[PDB]
Amino acid sequence: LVIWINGDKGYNGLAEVGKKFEKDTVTVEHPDKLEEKFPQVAADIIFWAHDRFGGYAQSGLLAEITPAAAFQDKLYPFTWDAVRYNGKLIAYPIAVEALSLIYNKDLLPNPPKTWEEIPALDKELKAKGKSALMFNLQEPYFTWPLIAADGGYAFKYAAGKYDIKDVGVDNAGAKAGLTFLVDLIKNKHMNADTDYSIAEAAFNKGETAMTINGPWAWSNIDTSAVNYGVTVLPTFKGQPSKPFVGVLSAGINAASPNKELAKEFLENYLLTDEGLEAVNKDKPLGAVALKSYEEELAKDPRIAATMENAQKGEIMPNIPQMSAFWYAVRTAVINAASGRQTVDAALAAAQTNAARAAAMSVALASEYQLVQNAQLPQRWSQSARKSLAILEATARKEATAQMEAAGGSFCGQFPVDPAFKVLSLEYSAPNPDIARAIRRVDSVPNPPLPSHVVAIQSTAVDADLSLAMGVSLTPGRHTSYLVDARALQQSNSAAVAARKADGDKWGPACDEMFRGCRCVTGQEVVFYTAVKEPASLFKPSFDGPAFRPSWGELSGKATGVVACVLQVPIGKETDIICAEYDNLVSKGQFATVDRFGGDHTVNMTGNALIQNDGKAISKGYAVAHRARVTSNVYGKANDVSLQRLAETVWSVVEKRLSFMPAYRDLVITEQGKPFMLGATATNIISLTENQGVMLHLDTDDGVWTIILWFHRHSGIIAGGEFVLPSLGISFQPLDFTIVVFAANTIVHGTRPLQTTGKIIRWGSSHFLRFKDVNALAQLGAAYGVDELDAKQRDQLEEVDAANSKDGVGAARRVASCMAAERKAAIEAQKAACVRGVVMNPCTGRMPSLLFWQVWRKP
DNA sequence: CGCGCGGGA
DNA sequence: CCCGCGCG
Numbered sequence: 001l002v003i004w005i006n007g008d009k010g011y012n013g014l015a016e017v018g019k020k021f022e023k024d025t026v027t028v029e030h031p032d033k034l035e036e037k038f039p040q041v042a043a044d045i046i047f048w049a050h051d052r053f054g055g056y057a058q059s060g061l062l063a064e065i066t067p068a069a070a071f072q073d074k075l076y077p078f079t080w081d082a083v084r085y086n087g088k089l090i091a092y093p094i095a096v097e098a099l100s101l102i103y104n105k106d107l108l109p110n111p112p113k114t115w116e117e118i119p120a121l122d123k124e125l126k127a128k129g130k131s132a133l134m135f136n137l138q139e140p141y142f143t144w145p146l147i148a149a150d151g152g153y154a155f156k157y158a159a160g161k162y163d164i165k166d167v168g169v170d171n172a173g174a175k176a177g178l179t180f181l182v183d184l185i186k187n188k189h190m191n192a193d194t195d196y197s198i199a200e201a202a203f204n205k206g207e208t209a210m211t212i213n214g215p216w217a218w219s220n221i222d223t224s225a226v227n228y229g230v231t232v233l234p235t236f237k238g239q240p241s242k243p244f245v246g247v248l249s250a251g252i253n254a255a256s257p258n259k260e261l262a263k264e265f266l267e268n269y270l271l272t273d274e275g276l277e278a279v280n281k282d283k284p285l286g287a288v289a290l291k292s293y294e295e296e297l298a299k300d301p302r303i304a305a306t307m308e309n310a311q312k313g314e315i316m317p318n319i320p321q322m323s324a325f326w327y328a329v330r331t332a333v334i335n336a337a338s339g340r341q342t343v344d345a346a347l348a349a350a351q352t353n354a355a356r357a358a359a360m361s362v363a364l365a366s367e368y369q370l371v372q373n374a375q376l377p378q379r380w381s382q383s384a385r386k387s388l389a390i391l392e393a394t395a396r397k398e399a400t401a402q403m404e405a406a407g408g409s410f411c412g413q414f415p416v417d418p419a420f421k422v423l424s425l426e427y428s429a430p431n432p433d434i435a436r437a438i439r440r441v442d443s444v445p446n447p448p449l450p451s452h453v454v455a456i457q458s459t460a461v462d463a464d465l466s467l468a469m470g471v472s473l474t475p476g477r478h479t480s481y482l483v484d485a486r487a488l489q490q491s492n493s494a495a496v497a498a499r500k501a502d503g504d505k506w507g508p509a510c511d512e513m514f515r516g517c518r519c520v521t522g523q524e525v526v527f528y529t530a531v532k533e534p535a536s537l538f539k540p541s542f543d544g545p546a547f548r549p550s551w552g553e554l555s556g557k558a559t560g561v562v563a564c565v566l567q568v569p570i571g572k573e574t575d576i577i578c579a580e581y582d583n584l585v586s587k588g589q590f591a592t593v594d595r596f597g598g599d600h601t602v603n604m605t606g607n608a609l610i611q612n613d614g615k616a617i618s619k620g621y622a623v624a625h626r627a628r629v630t631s632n633v634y635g636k637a638n639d640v641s642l643q644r645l646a647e648t649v650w651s652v653v654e655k656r657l658s659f660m661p662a663y664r665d666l667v668i669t670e671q672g673k674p675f676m677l678g679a680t681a682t683n684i685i686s687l688t689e690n691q692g693v694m695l696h697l698d699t700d701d702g703v704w705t706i707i708l709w710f711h712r713h714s715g716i717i718a719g720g721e722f723v724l725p726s727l728g729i730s731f732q733p734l735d736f737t738i739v740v741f742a743a744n745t746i747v748h749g750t751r752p753l754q755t756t757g758k759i760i761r762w763g764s765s766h767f768l769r770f771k772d773v774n775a776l777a778q779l780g781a782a783y784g785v786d787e788l789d790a791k792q793r794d795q796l797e798e799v800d801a802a803n804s805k806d807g808v809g810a811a812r813r814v815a816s817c818m819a820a821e822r823k824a825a826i827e828a829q830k831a832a833c834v835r836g837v838v839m840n841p842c843t844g845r846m847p848s849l850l851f852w853q854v855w856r857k858p
Numbered sequence: 859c860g861c862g863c864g865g866g867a
Numbered sequence: 868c869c870c871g872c873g874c875g
């Protein structure tokens with residue numbers, strides 16, 4: 001029973017209830033952004049507003065609650081309606097919150113019962129130098145109660161489901177309400193500038209007679225000198241104003257052992273007057289869903305008003321398409337306050353757009369399911385498998401005779417012997433080409449493979465997986481592995497634990513996992529994970545088409561490619577890649593940053609969009625933007641350089657991994673292609689110089705990431721191993737080692753290194769950072785793709801002029817103003833569902849893996 | 859090159 | 868708050 005709750009609630013009082021529970025037969029925590037973390041991380045009770053829980057129910061991450069009908073009598077009926085998705089109770093209600101009318105008793109002993117009285121009161125109070133009303137007009141959450149009083153709704157509700165095609169923005173009731181709000185602004189009774197902080201400051205300072213706020217504000221008003229009351233929201237045209245109602249709710253996740261135990265704790269250890277009172281003592285709960293305790297609290301007039309307005313209002317829809325509703329209505333109110341549209345114009349356009357975006361979002365969810373379940377172009381067959389197995393077994397004989405003749409196995413000039421683990425190694429730089437791995441210096445006996453990872457012995461199995469997964473490693477000279485998926489997830493967590501435990505660095509616990517990693521230096525390998533058919537981390541569709549594997553242990557499982565290590569023979573391609581890194585470094589095109597605190601120093605290039613730079617309106621880091629304008633030879637030179645670097649590396653990988661192009665084609669949108677680096681799935685490229693990196697999962701990158709290494713100057717490197725602790729392996733990069741791995745789902749790092757001589761190990765990742773490609777596809781939509789270079793040229797000149805006239809603080813004013821315009825442009829395209837990549841709508845990230853292949857052997 | 863300013867949130 | 872940016 002580990003219960004999550006938001007940090008700003010009463011956790012210590014809940015801990016009291018849980019102590020009183022643990023006795024008769026637990027740990028409450030406050031993780032940052034719980035509402036984003038819980039959606040990704042479920043694969044435990046959770047305390048959060050019901051509106052997210054509807055999305056968790058479409059996501060199946062919440063246990064159906066089965067409360068007794070006598071228990072359901074203990075709480076209010078509308079609270080249970082807030083937690084029932086598709087006719088199934090998704091959680092237990094706790095608290096009820098909604099906006100109320102807050103008023104200063106010394107200016108206003110009798111607050112107005114109707115909105116229509118307010119204009120008359122403002123006249124009088126303006127004569128005294130004060131005002132009738134000040135509330136946040138910037139967010140529709142606050143303005144909607146007035147708008148919807150006379151009719152008008154978000155999405156129509158019937159049969160326990162919201163019709164996303166039936167929006168109520170344009171209804172006559174909504175038109176009258178928005179009209180009354182704008183009339184108040186025109187007569188200077190309110191000013192369309194008024195935000196949360198302004199209105200809060202003006203009320204708590206006695207400068208206005210009323211504001212509109214929820215219970216969170218009560219705590220702040222209590223510190224002021226204001227004698228205030230809290231009452232029902234004014235009626236509009238004799239109608240109750242309808243504030244949205246949020247029910248703080250406790251839910252149980254479908255990935256939980258303790259389900260009937262947790263159900264017992266919630267029913268008769270917290271949802272009691274004793275338990276809710278202990279929490280209310282810690283932090284104020286507001287109104288309560290339990291009828292017994294709500295009658296106690298409502299003795300407080302402020303609490304009675306909160307439940308009053310909550311019952312007079314509408315329960316906030318728990319569907320994700322409410323985001324569309326919110327963006328369209330936010331724009332309608334803003335425009336109709338600033339006279340940028342008529343009330344009737346702004347509500348008509350918001351009705352249209354909100355319904356449009358709700359439609360596209362449901363369409364996008366179904367398109368995403370096809371992405372996740374997509375299959376590689378079928379090249380597997382039993383005949384193909386057999387003929388490929390003959391070719392592989394033959395290449396194994398050819399490779400064995402080549403090893404007898406040469407006296408050992410070799411990667412470039414480096415002696416490969418998997419009996420030894422290479423702890424330090426020497427590189428020679430005989431000439432101006434890349435430094436070459438020549439000698440193993442320090443070693444230990446090579447630790448065995450961990451029990452969850454198996455080397456595939458059969459050439460037939462090697463062929464099965466090669467054809468079905470789109471992997472063709474160097475024939476006769478590779479090792480394929482199979483990793484159980486449950487144990488892979490266990491070990492990923494064990495590795496993150498060790499890193500945390502060490503102080504977010506390489507320390508003893510990370511070193512302990514490393515000591516049991518097996519060396520695959522010099523080797524070319526692929527690790528396939530296998531998912532047993534349920535009868536969590538990864539999401540294979542077991543309804544997909546099934547192949548008959550030759551090995552029975554695959555039957556009833558799905559396979560996917562989590563990691564592959566390549567050894568690139570030095571030649572034309574390594575010359576091209578290394579030359580581009582040298583060109584970009586020499587030309588000052590890398591943006592030096594610190595990563596993971598001060599874990600390491602990385603250099604970045606590629607098609608970033610650093611929104612933090614306000615003048616940034618085109619692809620590239622800020623040096624790139626400048627180079628296109630200031631060059632006196634060719635403005636696109638660095639872009640040609642970046643495209644060739646990404647395409648040469650991509651091509652090298654593609655030859656061995658035929659699924660990579662398939663993945664690129666599957667996840668990059670038409671709108672995203674111009675902002676990828678050439679015809680690859682790479683938009684950002686890193687570069688490290690002799691850096692270790694701590695063990696981590698990359699969360700906001702693509703499905704598969706590429707890392708490559710190369711060397712300059714002679715010397716000796718100790719440490720610097722690349723480690724994949726959940727696959728139970730590590731390796732020293734040699735002449736030109738590349739790893740392609742699923743970084744969303746595979747913990748990885750790089751041990752610290754110590755060097756002798758001038759030797760430099762250059763590490764570089766080629767990855768897909770989806771935020772930059774999405775924002776750039778959005779900028780392209782709003783302004784035109786080919787117009788961004790011209791806009792970026794104008795913004796650089798405008799800022800440089802400002803600096804050279806009025807000082808740097810003028811220049812900063814200009815940059816911040818450009819950021820707001822860029823931001824608004826992006827937000828509009830974002831609201832129209834413009835994306836550069838396809839993303840999981842549930843997780844807000846790219847899928848965990850792709851191209852799952854189901855195997856069955858009847 | 860250390861450090862303030864800065865954006866999205 | 869983080870695989871930026873530009874100023875002293």
Ligand SMILES: O=C1O[C@H]([C@@H](O)CO)C(O)=C1O
Binds near residue numbers: 748762
């Ligand atoms: O461990 C790592 O090494 C590379 C680094 O050399 C380039 O950034 C990187 O991406 C890490 O995840």
Ligand SMILES: [Fe+2]
Binds near residue numbers: 743748
């Ligand atoms: Fe990484």
